[PDB]
């Protein structure tokens, strides 16, 4: 639907309008790599978190890898200039990804207790900074 909706590849503008796209790409890959490096550092096994992570992207958004992945698709829908698909992936990705976030969060709240409780009190905003 993004490819259908977006204008033809020669009609979309360039110059100083394609510099924001580069900004979005680089900030996405910074946030995702920082989140991954912070999450994988504290796990002894492949996915077994020893402690509670609250650093970098974790002090802004409780689930930063997920947000970074969606922001990748959002920048992608901005690239071919199709905002309608951006909104629809917002809806569907938010729904599924919130479901998995709830399952994961309830698991590690059960397994950790007060630490992730006060951490989630510190950062309520779960996916987008002060939007949700």
């Amino acid at each position: 639907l993004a490819a259908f909706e977006g204008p033809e590849l020669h009609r979309l503008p360039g110059g100083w309008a394609n510099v924001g796209i580069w900004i979005l790409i680089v900030i996405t890959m910074l946030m995702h790599y920082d989140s991954t490096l912070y999450l994988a550092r504290y796990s002894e096994k492949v996915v077994v978190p020893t402690a509670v992570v609250q650093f970098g992207p974790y002090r802004w958004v409780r689930h930063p890898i997920y947000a970074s992945t969606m922001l990748l698709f959002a920048a992608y829908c901005t690239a071919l200039r199709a905002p309608l698909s951006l909104l629809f992936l917002l809806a569907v990705c938010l729904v599924y990804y919130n479901k998995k976030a709830k399952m994961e969060e309830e698991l590690m709240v059960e397994s950790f207790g007060q630490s992730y409780s006060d951490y989630a009190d510190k950062v309520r905003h779960k996916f987008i900074p002060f939007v949700y």
Binding site: A51, Q54, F55, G56
Partner: protein, 49 residues
């Protein structure tokens, strides 16, 4: 905020240069209490340097 009477009762066997370097160690050990990482502090220290 610091009750300096307790600190003075804790540094009795020391000397004036140690009395001068006491607040440095107090700030270090007070920042020790929280749970924090290393690499972010290196990053901010290097940036502010």
């Amino acid at each position: 905020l610091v009750d300096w009477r307790k600190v003075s009762e804790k540094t009795t066997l020391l000397r004036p240069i140690e009395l001068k370097l006491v607040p440095m160690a107090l700030e270090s050990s007070a920042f020790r209490s929280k749970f924090l990482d290393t690499d972010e502090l290196l990053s901010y220290v290097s940036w502010f340097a």
